[PDB]
Structures are given as structure tokens and as C-alpha cells.
Curated annotation (Swiss-Prot):
Implicated disorder: Wiskott-Aldrich syndrome: An X-linked recessive immunodeficiency characterized by eczema, thrombocytopenia, recurrent infections, and bloody diarrhea. Death usually occurs before age 10.
Location in or out of the cell: Cytoplasm, Cytoskeleton; Nucleus
Source taxon at top rank: Eukaryota
The protein's name: Actin nucleation-promoting factor WAS
Tissue: Expressed predominantly in the thymus. Also found, to a much lesser extent, in the spleen.
Quaternary state and interactors: Binds the Arp2/3 complex. Interacts with CDC42, RAC, NCK, HCK, FYN, SRC kinase FGR, BTK, ABL1, PSTPIP1, WIP, and to the p85 subunit of PLC-gamma. Interacts (via C-terminus) with ALDOA. Interacts with NCK1 (via SH3 domains). Interacts with FCHSD2.
Protein purpose: Effector protein for Rho-type GTPases that regulates actin filament reorganization via its interaction with the Arp2/3 complex. Important for efficient actin polymerization. Possible regulator of lymphocyte and platelet function. Mediates actin filament reorganization and the formation of actin pedestals upon infection by pathogenic bacteria. In addition to its role in the cytoplasmic cytoskeleton, also promotes actin polymerization in the nucleus, thereby regulating gene transcription and repair of damaged DNA.
Signal peptide annotation: none
Description of its domains: The WH1 (Wasp homology 1) domain may bind a Pro-rich ligand.
Modification Phosphotyrosine occurs at: 50
Post-translational modification: Phosphorylated at Tyr-50 by FYN and HCK, inducing WAS effector activity after TCR engagement. Phosphorylation at Tyr-50 enhances WAS activity in promoting actin polymerization and filopodia formation.
Phosphoserine: residues carrying this PTM: 98-99
Annotated source species: Homo sapiens (Human)
Residue span, CRIB domain: 1-10
Amino acid sequence: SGFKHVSHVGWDPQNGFDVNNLDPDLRSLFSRAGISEAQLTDAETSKLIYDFIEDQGGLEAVRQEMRRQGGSGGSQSSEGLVGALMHVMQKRSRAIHSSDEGEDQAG
Ligand SMILES: CN(C)C[C@H](O)Cn1c2ccc(Br)cc2c2cc(Br)ccc21
């Protein structure tokens, strides 16, 4: 499997998440799913989560959607769009520390 390269993307395999300049809309898109700077301030998770802003069609590409699916925040239904990002984090939540499993030291 794989994905098709895109020059119109904002994220790249280097920096990660630009919280300092994170789009307002996108900002709430995270706080709603249950994600903090801790998950965005990690080059390891920054990519693991990019599968969302990447698959969704695009961060700015989502703004045009958020405008249709809702209004200006508030507190009306947390699902829809955000409910998906919650499932993407579950994948990492299920993993405790199996990736780094293999003790060789004795004593
Ligand atoms: C349609 N796809 C292929 C294009 C990009 O994969 C979509 N995309 C963005 C577009 C604009 C900005 Br600004 C930020 C992002 C972004 C951030 C993360 Br993390 C993951 C995917 C992201």
C-alpha cells in the first residue's frame, strides 16, 4: 500500500505540528477529539496523526467542511469529524510498549 505525494500539503516529514501557528478551526478539531500539545509536539506522533489531516482531505481543506458541519464552536455534538480522530488515537492507546519489547540484559 501507500499514498500519493502532494505538494499542496502543509505538513512535512520534518517539523510536525505547527501549534504556534495552528489554524483556529483545526485547533478545535483536536481539543474536541481529545488531543493536546503533547501528542502534537512529538515527531513520532506528529506523523501518526497526520493520517487524519492527510486523509480528511487537508487541514485547510477541512475548514471548508467545518463551516458546513457546525457554526462557531460552542458545545453542540462533539462527534462528526472529531469522532474519527478519536479512533486514530486508539491505535496508539492500545500499544503500551510492545514496539520496544526485547530485553537482552541479564542481572
Ligand atoms: C490531501 N493530502 C494528501 C494533503 C495533506 O496530507 C493534508 N494535510 C495538510 C494540508 C494543509 C496544512 Br496547513 C496542514 C496539513 C496536514 C497536517 C497533518 Br499532521 C497531516 C496531513 C495534512
